[PDB]
C-alpha cells in the first residue's frame, strides 16, 4: 500500500524560478520568488532530493530541461519532483518569453515516455495563477 | 500486465482552477511558505496527502491579502491537489 522507497536515491528535483520577464510578455517582476526558491531548495534538499535551480527560463529552456530530465536513467531513484514558480493562466505557465502548456512539460514523464520512472511517483508543485478570479472568503 | 501511462502523477497547485495565487514580495508566496513550514516539521513522518491537506488548511486559514487596491484587499486562497497516485507516499525508509 506504500510506494517502495528503498532506492539509492530519493530522486531528482528541478526548481524553475522565473522572476524576470521580457517586456513583450507584459508581465511584471515576481518579487519574493527568490525567497520561495531558496526555502524550497532547503526543504527538498533535506528530504533527500538532488535539487538544481534554474532561473528566468525561456519556454524552450523549460521544455528542454524537463525533456532531458525525463530521458535520464532513474533506475536507482525512488521518485521525481519538479517545482514551477512563475506567472500563469489556466493550463499554462510563463517562461521569460511567453506561455507554454503545463501538459507538455509533464507529458515527458508519462509511463510510456520515461520507463525508469514507471510505477514511481512523479511530483509537480506549481505556484502560478490559474485565472483572474478572486476568492472574497466568508464569515 | 499494463499500467496506465497517466498513472502515478501528483500535481500540487497553489490555487484552484480559474483563480489567482497570492505572493508577498517580502516573504514569498502563500503556498510556498505554507508548504515549506509543513515539510520542515513533518516531511519525514506524514504521508504526502496528509502533508498537502495541512498545507491547504494553513493557506486557507493563516493568510488574508492586504492591498491598497480595494479590489485585491482581504482576499483568500485555497490550494488544489490533484492525485493520480496509486500508493501512499512517505519520504523516509
Amino acid at each position: 500500500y506504500q510506494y517502495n522507497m528503498n532506492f539509492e536515491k530519493l530522486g531528482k528535483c528541478i526548481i524553475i524560478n522565473n522572476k524576470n520577464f521580457d517586456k513583450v510578455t507584459g508581465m511584471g517582476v515576481r518579487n519574493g520568488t527568490d525567497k520561495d526558491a531558496e526555502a524550497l531548495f532547503k526543504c527538498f534538499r533535506s528530504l533527500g532530493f538532488d535539487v538544481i535551480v534554474y532561473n528566468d527560463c525561456s519556454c524552450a529552456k523549460m521544455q528542454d530541461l524537463l525533456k532531458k530530465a525525463s530521458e535520464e536513467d532513474h533506475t536507482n531513484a525512488a521518485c521525481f519532483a519538479c517545482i514551477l514558480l512563475s506567472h500563469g493562466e489556466e493550463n499554462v505557465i510563463y517562461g521569460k518569453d511567453g506561455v507554454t502548456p503545463i501538459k507538455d512539460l509533464t507529458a515527458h514523464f508519462r509511463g510510456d515516455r520515461c520507463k525508469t520512472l514507471l510505477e514511481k511517483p512523479k511530483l509537480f508543485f506549481i505556484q502560478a495563477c490559474r485565472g483572474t478570479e478572486l476568492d472574497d472568503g466568508i464569515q | 500486465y499494463k499500467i496506465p501511462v497517466e498513472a502515478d502523477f501528483l500535481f500540487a497547485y497553489s490555487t484552484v482552477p480559474g483563480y489567482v495565487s497570492m505572493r508577498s514580495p517580502g516573504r514569498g508566496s502563500w503556498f510556498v511558505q505554507a508548504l515549506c513550514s509543513i515539510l520542515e516539521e513533518h516531511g519525514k513522518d506524514l504521508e504526502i496527502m496528509q502533508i498537502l491537506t495541512r498545507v491547504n488548511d494553513r493557506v486557507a486559514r493563516h493568510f488574508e491579502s492586504c492591498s491598497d487596491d480595494p479590489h485585491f484587499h482581504e482576499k483568500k486562497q485555497i490550494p488544489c491537489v490533484v492525485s493520480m497516485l496509486t500508493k501512499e507516499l512517505y519520504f523516509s525508509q
Binding site: 502560478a128 495563477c129 | 489567482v20 495565487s21 497570492m22 505572493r23
Partner: peptide, 4 residues
C-alpha cells in the same frame, strides 16, 4: 500583496 500581488498576484501571479
Amino acid at each position: 500583496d500581488e498576484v501571479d
